[PDB]
Design a protein around this ligand. Structure first.
Ligand SMILES: NCc1ccc(CNC(=O)[C@@H]2Cc3ccc(cc3)NC(=O)CCN3CCN(CCC(=O)Nc4ccc(cc4)C[C@@H](NS(=O)(=O)c4cccc(Cl)c4)C(=O)N2)CC3)cc1
Length: 243
């Protein structure tokens, strides 16, 4: 069962936001160098497949340079039941968009703490003001939580508005979506790239965005930009089916 956490997540009372309830985001992955340094996030979407951002892989096209950590809450002192799986192959999206698939060397073991996220239907458009969640271990910019998995609940901003001069001034593609608090203070940041933007739909969480870029982090009128997963579901499914 994708999208349904065994440990239920909690809202807040990553810059700002709050520390997640441990293991409430069981599809969250830590992308690390073959030396063990965290540098990006990802999302488990099936036992053998992780979705991340293509820019997270710019340094090396060799699958050997990457390892995936699953089931973690601490970033440094990894808990014992954490799964560390090597990457067997890399699939960059073929039209140069900021999304990529990692095929794991072995299927992740599905547990209470490691569960895949669900994928959306093709071309679904998250509606304006939908409150979704972003998660990760990235920079906190003096906001507490460093070293622990953090979350933030952010409203989606429809592309027609996000592209106005007052916000991102024509920079956002239809294959991307915008989310964030326009007053600033809470945002994904460096170290969170490649990680998930999930939305609650009926009874489970659906992966709708991949953390990609922004004009800074948590600045006023500068919401984060995410790859719009629904525009790549058909590609993703074809890669999994044929590999
Ligand atoms: N929730 C906020 C947030 C969350 C998580 C993060 C981590 N992710 C990054 O770090 C990305 C990495 C990256 C690089 C290239 C790329 C995609 C992602 N895609 C192409 O290469 C594809 C080719 N074209 C690129 C241009 N595009 C036109 C629209 C446009 O201009 N897109 C920008 C893209 C990158 C930047 C700026 C603009 C540069 C920097 N932004 S930054 O202001 O300098 C900065 C951010 C954070 C901290 C600091 Cl200190 C500085 C920036 O985000 N890099 C069309 C396609 C950051 C922000």
């Amino acid at each position: 069962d994708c999208g349904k956490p065994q440990v239920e997540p909690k809202k807040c009372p990553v810059v700002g936001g709050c520390v997640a309830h441990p293991h409430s985001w069981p599809w969250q992955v830590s992308l690390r160098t073959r030396f063990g340094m965290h540098f990006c996030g990802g999302t488990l979407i099936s036992p053998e497949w992780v979705l991340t951002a293509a820019h997270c892989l710019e340094k090396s096209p060799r699958p050997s340079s990457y390892k995936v950590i699953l089931g973690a809450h601490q970033e440094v002192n990894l808990e014992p039941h954490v799964q560390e799986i090597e990457v067997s192959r890399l699939f960059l999206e073929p039209t140069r968009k900021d999304i990529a698939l990692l095929k794991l060397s072995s299927p992740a073991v599905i547990t209470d703490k490691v569960i895949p996220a669900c994928l959306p239907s093709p071309n679904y458009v998250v509606a304006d003001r939908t409150e979704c969640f972003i998660t990760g271990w990235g920079e906190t910019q003096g906001t507490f939580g460093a070293g622990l998995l953090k979350e933030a609940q952010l409203p989606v901003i429809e592309n027609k508005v996000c592209n106005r001069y007052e916000f991102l001034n024509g920079r956002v593609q239809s294959t991307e979506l915008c989310a964030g608090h326009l007053a600033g203070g809470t945002d994904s940041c460096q170290g969170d790239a490649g990680g998930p933007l999930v939305c609650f739909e009926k009874d489970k969480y659906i992966l709708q965005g991949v953390t990609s870029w922004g004009l800074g982090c948590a600045r006023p009128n500068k919401p984060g930009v995410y790859v719009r997963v629904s525009r790549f579901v058909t590609w993703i499914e074809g890669v999994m089916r044929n590999n």
